[PDB]
Amino acid sequence: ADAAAGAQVFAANCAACHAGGNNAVMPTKTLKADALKTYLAGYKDGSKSLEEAVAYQVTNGQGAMPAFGGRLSDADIANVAAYIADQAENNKW
Ligand code: HEC
Numbered sequence: 001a002d003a004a005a006g007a008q009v010f011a012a013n014c015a016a017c018h019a020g021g022n023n024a025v026m027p028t029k030t031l032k033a034d035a036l037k038t039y040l041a042g043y044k045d046g047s048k049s050l051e052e053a054v055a056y057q058v059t060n061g062q063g064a065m066p067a068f069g070g071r072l073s074d075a076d077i078a079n080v081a082a083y084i085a086d087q088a089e090n091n092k093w
Helices: 005-015 017-021 033-038 050-060 074-089
Strands: none
Touching: 005 017, 005 074, 033 074, 050 074
């Protein structure tokens, strides 16, 4: 999906909890490449790509992280997942 469009979704919906690619709530579980591969459901087990696993967790929530299905459009969810994947894979945080 469109990482550049996803940056705007991130600023509007994710930066209060994840400024800098970190995690204000659960500090280990950051948005950096190494942390994602260790802790993000589906991606950590190899059964999902990074981008799919991010999209799933944004849509459905996890733990203390709220769900965004019904709050964000399909394209916005897909695009923010692409932003996370691009930021992490290319070490841009
Ligand atoms: C604070 C109320 C949050 C908001 C809003 C968003 N996220 Fe979040 N996220 C939060 C927590 C507490 C956690 C950990 C969940 C758990 O217990 O495992 C997460 C996790 C993620 C992850 C995975 C990180 C990892 O496992 O290392 C991703 C990819 C993620 N969050 C993305 C994300 C996006 C894109 C958001 C805006 C749509 C978003 N989160 C909001 C807390 C909060």
